[PDB]
Design a protein around this nucleic acid. Sequence first.
DNA 1: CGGGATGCTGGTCGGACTG
DNA 2: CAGTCCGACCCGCATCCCGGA
Lengths: 411, 412
Amino acid sequence: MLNQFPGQYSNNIFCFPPIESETKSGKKASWIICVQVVQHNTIIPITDEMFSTDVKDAVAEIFTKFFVEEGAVRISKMTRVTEGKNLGKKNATTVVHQAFKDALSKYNRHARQKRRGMIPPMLVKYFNIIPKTFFEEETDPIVQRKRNGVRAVACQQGDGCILLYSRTEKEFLGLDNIKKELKQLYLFIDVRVYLDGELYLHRKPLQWIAGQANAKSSELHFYVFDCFWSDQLQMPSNKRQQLLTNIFKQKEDLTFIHQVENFSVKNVDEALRLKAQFIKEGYEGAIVRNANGPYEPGYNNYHSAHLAKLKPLLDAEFILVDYTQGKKGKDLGAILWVCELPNKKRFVVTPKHLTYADRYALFQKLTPALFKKHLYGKELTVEYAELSPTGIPLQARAVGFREPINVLEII
Amino acid sequence: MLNQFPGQYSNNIFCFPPIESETKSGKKASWIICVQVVQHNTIIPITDEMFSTDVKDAVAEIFTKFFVEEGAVRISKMTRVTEGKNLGKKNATTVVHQAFKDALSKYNRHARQKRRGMIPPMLVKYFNIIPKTFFEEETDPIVQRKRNGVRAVACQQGDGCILLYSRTEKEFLGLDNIKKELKQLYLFIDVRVYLDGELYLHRKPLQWIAGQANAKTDSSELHFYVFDCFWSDQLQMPSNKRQQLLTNIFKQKEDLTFIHQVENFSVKNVDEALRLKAQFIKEGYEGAIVRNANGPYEPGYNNYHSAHLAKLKPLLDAEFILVDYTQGKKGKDLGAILWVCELPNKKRFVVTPKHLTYADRYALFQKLTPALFKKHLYGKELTVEYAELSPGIPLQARAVGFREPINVLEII
DNA sequence: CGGGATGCTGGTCGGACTG
DNA sequence: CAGTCCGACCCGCATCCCGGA
Ligand SMILES: Nc1ncnc2c1ncn2[C@@H]1O[C@H](COP(=O)(O)OP(=O)(O)OP(=O)(O)O)[C@@H](O)[C@H]1O
Ligand SMILES: Nc1ncnc2c1ncn2[C@@H]1O[C@H](COP(=O)(O)OP(=O)(O)OP(=O)(O)O)[C@@H](O)[C@H]1O
Ligand SMILES: [Cl-]
């Protein structure tokens, strides 16, 4: 299929992307290679069918065009492809398909003769909250599913090696099914691009997925949800996702590598419905990306404020050790609980099922005495997001106690 | 030049190493490829001169031999090499040289069709001490120079990539001069081998060497000095055997410019080892490495240090505040005074008086008082020769002397 | 300095080859 | 007769050498 090759198609002539460079004189140079199909002294339009079956007396011609900054163009002689290769085998190529292969050959080699390490993948700062600025952009944010697998970044070392490394900046062993497909895909795409994704196979626990990724069965898939260039880390998230989609338009025959579906939302409610939907399809949640977010690598565990994860909260039990009130605004005068981690380190937990009138009334009517006799030392189940690395649970809310009490009635 | 190719030479026929395999029946199979040079219907001996100039009407013949466990041998047809390649260019090969290239081709491909990640480099436990067990082995230990550079392990990923990683298990950028030569060297050597060495360029500070190794834009001026090798499937292999394999690897290619084997020295006693250490310091190296002859390769998994290597280097210098004194507990150190300095973190450690006899250490610990020490030694600054920092206390610490010099034997 | 030619390794294809 | 080896064919990466500026 055409458009699997990089470049623009126009007036029946397909041209690969111009490769620009500087010369000794300091002027700008451009070099372009182009493919055309000639039958009966006529350039005919290129069709997807002629990649499977030849057309009678059609000849493919390849030529290059070269010119300095605002100078006259120079053309090469036409190399005529009149015949496919591996002509007897199942490897056989059509004339047209073989010409594009030779064109992409000369193109990739020209790029190599006239032209990179591991970058830590970007990390998500926000958790079940979407900053209002996400919907103040000219473009709507993107929503993606949140797969509970193992994270991996792909790149090509320039010598030709495909690098698959981890969130801990560690190269992966095995995954030959994926590295094989990445080697194929990198012939058709810019070799400097980093592909950022998740190793995963659906309906499988993370212990199994992490088991295959770390160990040295070729059954995992690679779901790419982002890309970036080392020299253009400020490129907006939106533009990075159009480029990523042009990369995957090229190859749709891949079996183990997949682009992650992108969803547009205009408000928080649209986003929370997609998060609901992905949980029922068995995923871990949703990812929200600001449309103008740059690529902020996670150097020294840095989290970007232009992504948000939408996940369900974790469950745990803690010992209630004290109570207090909120400080800021509406939370001022509203009661908060103080649980404690086994390290005697303590944290605030928010009553989830009480109105603000209750939180005000409860903090007014409670005494150190009545809390020592009825609440101290009780076990309290706490929905929380993450543990601050401090170990403190973040965004902690009290679901309820084991032994059920009504705190409104305590005397 | 012949011995640049793996295999044995005998009766004028060179044969590459047998590649063994299993069959469905479970019997052992062996496959061998061999090269011979025939002139006038006679196998003539292969010479290094035939790699630069052809011999008239000599033809090189390549053939394979294949046989199952204790079964009759099967022979292939002879592939005749009558002509070198790149015949007009400076790339030209002789007939004989071209045949060995084609043999090593079929050999490497057969090995690939019938057949690995980072392992943390092994770490040195002992410091300016050589255990007596090093000299109880059937073979004498090996001493090497200690280059103050950056450590690196080389291996080949099997797909064809050359991996150069660090002690931190992190792949290196740049070093194209070194990776280029490793790719050429790995055509002739077992592809399963790890080469363990040091990135270095002599008479240059470590800030510069580390500067070129870490950055992705080095000037391609560093060298790679290999001092060990290992196989993932045979980490119990004794140090001695690993160094012959390593030396056979480097016998092959001596044309390399950026890759070097580290000179091996035999010693029979501690004094022999310390003279080599002295000698390397005067040539500007950091010290010596001592390897027990039967030491396996123990990778530094959780910063694990192997008790079958020892470094011999000069000690570091520092100043600490004297805060207390005590005595030794074990044997000859019993009743002998020790000082107690303190790190800025208020953590304290024992320092040994270096220039006092044991009679002095006994007398001092008997005659000293908390009073006399609080008034003349407490809080003073004391220079301390030490080895390393315990992962923070200085280890093997010795007192050179104080800033303001006092004679502690005369304190009253 | 751009590119054809040459040779190399790794990939796939297809036809023996042999227990 | 089931892998099991291997020549053949392509292709990306090197180097060598000769136009092409
Ligand atoms: N489409 C996606 N976009 C971004 N991240 C995704 C996506 N699908 C799955 N993920 C995973 O979610 C993680 C979000 O980054 P974050 O810093 O939140 O990780 P974490 O909190 O340490 O791990 P977890 O999110 O599992 O608790 C990434 O590491 C990635 O592996
Ligand atoms: N011939 C050699 N054999 C072994 N190690 C060598 C040799 N030459 C230099 N070295 C270096 O000495 C180091 C000894 O390992 P060790 O665990 O003692 O390192 P370290 O103590 O953390 O670093 P340093 O030795 O610089 O203090 C190796 O990492 C290696 O880089
Ligand atoms: Cl040396």
